[PDB]
Every structure is written in C-alpha cells, then in structure tokens.
C-alpha cells in the first residue's frame, strides 16, 4: 500500500508566502481523498469540475498540490475567475481549473503577539499573472512616470508587503493555510487513483 504523501503537504513544517507559492508533484500512489474531505479541520474545501464525495472513484495522470498562506478575507480569491491582489498578482487559477481548494485557519501557528511579518504578498505588478505563473521578483515598482533607479521613494515601491499576523486580529485578517490540488487528466496512463 503506497499512499500519496498528503501529510508532507498539509502538515509541512513551514508554509510559503503566497507570492512564492510552492508546488508538489504527486504521482504513482493511491490517494484517499475521503480522509481529507471528511476532516473537519478544513474551513474551506471547494472542488471545481469534480465532486468531492466521489473523489475516491477517479484516476488522474498527476496531481499537483500548491500551498501558501494568505489572510481570511482573501480565501475567496483562490478560485477561478476572481479578481484582487492575490488573484491578480500572487496566485491565479485558470478558468478551466479542475481541482479542489482547501484552507484552514492557522492563527494558532502563524500569528504571534508581537505580530508575525514573515509572510509576504505582492502588492504591485505591471500585469496580471497568467494561470499558475509564479513571480518571485523584488524589483522596485515604478508607479509613476519617473524611473526608480532601483531605489524606493515617491511612486517607487518595494513590490512585496508583509501581512502582519497577530492572534488578536479579526478573522478576515487572520492567517489561513491553503492547499490547491490540481487534477491533471490527460489521455495517458493514470498514476494517481483512489482505493
């Protein structure tokens, strides 16, 4: 019995900032999705193009698991066809997305009383991300007609900003860990199936 290593994804010690979202390739294993869907710890579990109760009856060539941290009010952006700073500049799903979006509140682990500022998001970008594009660039963003010469200043912004998570914040400003499972269905041999 070679189960898919979901634990390595969902219980990873550290989670990426959303701008630097991580992706794991899941192949050649048996996936018991029902353990995930039946887990109450998940505040969000939304599937697209498949039904979550029937996941254990389907086979895919590959599964991808993207993971990162965002704040509560932004979880709604992790869906096809959405707009906003996360959907436009940090993590973009395709319109034809087939998969599941899973999230849970991580205030107890990602907030700290002095405020935790290690988690970052991109606040400025010259164009919207293409689907599954990943931008890790740090160049000063030129908001006006004056070039920035790589220095921050008036209309010249560092493009990444910290969330600032402290446990006292409202739910919409608390940290959420997110895992997005992408189900690849090509017409090649399947390598990830349910039991």
């Amino acid at each position: 019995t070679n189960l898919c290593p979901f634990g390595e994804v969902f219980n990873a010690t550290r989670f990426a900032s959303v701008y630097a979202w991580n992706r794991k390739r899941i192949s050649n294993c048996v996936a018991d999705y029902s353990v995930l869907y039946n887990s109450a710890s998940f505040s969000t579990f939304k599937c697209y193009g498949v039904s979550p109760t029937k996941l254990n009856d389907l086979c895919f060539t590959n599964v991808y698991a993207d993971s990162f941290v965002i704040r509560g009010d932004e979880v709604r952006q992790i869906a096809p066809g959405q707009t906003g700073k996360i959907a436009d500049y940090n993590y973009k799903l395709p319109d034809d997305f087939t998969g599941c979006v899973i999230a849970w509140n991580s205030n107890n682990l990602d907030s700290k009383v002095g405020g935790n500022y290690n988690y970052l998001y991109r606040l400025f970008r010259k164009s919207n991300l293409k689907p599954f594009e990943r931008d890790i660039s740090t160049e000063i963003y030129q908001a006006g007609s004056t070039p920035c010469n790589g220095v921050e200043g008036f209309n010249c912004y560092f493009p990444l900003q910290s969330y600032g998570f402290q446990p006292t914040n409202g739910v919409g400003y608390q940290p959420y860990r997110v895992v997005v499972l992408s189900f690849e269905l090509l017409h090649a041999p399947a390598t990830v199936c349910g039991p």
Partner: antibody, heavy 121, light 107 residues
Framework: EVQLQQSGAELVKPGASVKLSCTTS????????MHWVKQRPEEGLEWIGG????????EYDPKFQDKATITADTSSNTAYLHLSRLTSEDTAVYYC??????????????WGQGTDLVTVS | DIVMTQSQKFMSTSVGDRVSVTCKAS??????VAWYQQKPGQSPKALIY???YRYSGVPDRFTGSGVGTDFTLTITNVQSEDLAEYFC????????FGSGTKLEIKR
C-alpha cells in the same frame, strides 16, 4: 530588469579545475532552484545539475556528478559551478538558470549570459 | 533518458507570416514542456511553460501546444527580431533539451 550575471570566460589547463559564479539581481535565489546547463555547437544543451539554496541539496545528471559541484550563497545571492579535472570535452558555454517553481521541477524562466570555458595548454 | 527530437534544423518564413516548430518526446511527458528562444550570441530566453502557457511579457504571437509526445511552438506575425534558434525542453524526468530549430527570414 532581472539579470543573472555570470563571471567571465576562463582559460583552463587540461586536468585543472575552475569555479564559475552567477549572481542574481531582481529576486532572491532562496525562493527557487538554481541550475547549470552546458552548451556546445554539436552536442547541444545539456543539463548539469541544480541546487536547492534553502537546504544546500544539489542533484546532478549522473554524467556530471563526479566532476561538477554546484553550491550557493544566499546572503550574496550567488550560485557556483565547480568543474574538476577538465578535458577538451569540457570546453563549452556554461549557463546559470533559475527555476519557475519551488517544490517540484519546472521550466527555467531566467538565464545568465553564459560563460565560455576553454580547456587548452 | 527522455530524448526531445526537433526534426527541423531550419525553417524559413517572411515577416508577417507564421511558422510552426515541432518537437517530439521519446516518452510521454504530459505537459512538462517548455520552449526557449536563443538569438545569436545570447543566452536562451524563456517563452512557454507547461506546454501551452506564455510567461508575462512574452509577445502573444508565441503559442505552445501539444500534450504527451508531440509539441509545437507556433509563431504568428513573424517579426525580424524573432530570428533565433528555438529549443523545446521536457522537465518530466530530469531535464533534456531538443536540438533546436533555426528560423530564417525571407525579405
């Protein structure tokens, strides 16, 4: 603009070693993998290996594992390629490149300008 | 080893026309395919990831297509600055590159 800046072309004696560098401007290498690729006119492009700058783990094509060593310094945002006991087959342009994703393999979005290594006496 | 074969060593076209570059993988690679442009004297530049996604900033006249073993890079409204060698790459198992297709412009 993002730029991977490589060190200059090198003349290397047969049997000797050389260390190439690639310094990134515009992103932090700790957010991706850094790879090295070899190019020659007739043999084409060949992946040598790549490194995970977070943990220091490097991996190589088996054809290169005994003579290539890839290292990284996150504090100076620099990746290095060490080649040992060079022969004429090591005369080539060596490129540094960064990866798109972290956690799994992906394409290489950014490439350095290349470093010509010539092996001769 | 997964071998990526580009059977076309050269292709010719005119400014404004379109051309399609072909790549065949020796094994199924799904969509773990990228395309790169290399102008003479310069390093490769990334054009396509995941077989058919274009990076931000890449002109929309570059399109990638194909799944499995057969892949195509299509260039429409060809411009003189597209003079380059075009290389496919698979990253499904390690990393291997095609042998490159050099574009020639008729004028």
């Amino acid at each position: 603009e993002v730029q991977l800046q490589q060190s200059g072309a090198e003349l290397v004696k047969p049997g000797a070693s050389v260390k190439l560098s690639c310094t990134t401007s515009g992103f932090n290498i700790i957010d991706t993998y850094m790879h090295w690729v070899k190019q020659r006119p007739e043999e084409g492009l060949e992946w040598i290996g790549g490194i995970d700058p977070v943990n220091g783990n490097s991996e190589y094509d088996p054809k290169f594992q005994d003579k290539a060593t890839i290292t990284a310094d996150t504090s100076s945002n620099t990746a290095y390629l060490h080649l040992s006991r060079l022969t004429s087959e090591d005369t080539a342009v060596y490129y540094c490149a960064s990866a798109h994703y972290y956690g799994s393999s992906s394409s290489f979005p950014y490439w350095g300008q290349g470093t010509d290594l010539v092996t001769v006496s | 080893d997964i071998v990526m074969t580009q059977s076309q060593k050269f292709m010719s076209t005119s400014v404004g026309d379109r051309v399609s570059v072909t790549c065949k993988a020796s094994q199924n690679v799904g969509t773990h395919v990228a395309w790169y442009q290399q102008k003479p004297g310069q390093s490769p530049k990334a054009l396509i990831y995941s077989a058919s996604y274009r990076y931000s900033g890449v002109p929309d006249r570059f399109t990638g297509s194909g799944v499995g073993t057969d892949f195509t890079l299509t260039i429409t409204n060809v411009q003189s600055e597209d003079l380059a060698e075009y290389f496919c790459q698979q990253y499904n198992s390690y990393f291997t590159f095609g042998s490159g297709t050099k574009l020639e412009i008729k004028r």
